[PDB]
């Protein structure tokens, strides 16, 4: 059946995204039993982004630091693979 790796863990896209990617990441979080918000707020744990770093994250960082960005291709290879990828591999850091 359906692995279940993002057990508890809620997720934001944050990102413009390509429409049909927004679905495949919902597709996949979901799928393998991932959470997803709706807005940020103190439940995120992961928030997806295709876009790059921004000034929100900081604040939002400095409010809620357990915070993980990462980019959709960890969604991605974790199905690819059918298992949790560390997201630091595909993470989104301020280039500075």
């Known amino acids: 059946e359906l692995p279940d790796f993002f057990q508890g863990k809620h ?3 944050y ?9 495949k ?3 996949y979080v979901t799928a393998f039993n991932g ?4 807005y940020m707020s103190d439940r995120v744990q ?12 900081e604040e939002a960082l400095m409010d809620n630091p357990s915070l993980a960005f990462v980019r959709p ?10 298992k949790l990828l560390p997201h630091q591999l595909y ?5 500075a």
């Open 11 to 13: 997720f934001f896209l």
């Open 15 to 23: 990102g413009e995204f390509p429409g049909d990617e927004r679905r």
């Open 25 to 27: 990441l919902i597709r």
């Open 35 to 38: 959470e997803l918000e709706d």
């Open 46 to 57: 992961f928030v997806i982004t295709a876009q790059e770093w921004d000034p929100s994250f």
């Open 73 to 82: 291709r960890w969604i991605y290879s974790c199905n690819e693979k059918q």
């Open 91 to 95: 993470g989104v850091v301020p280039q």
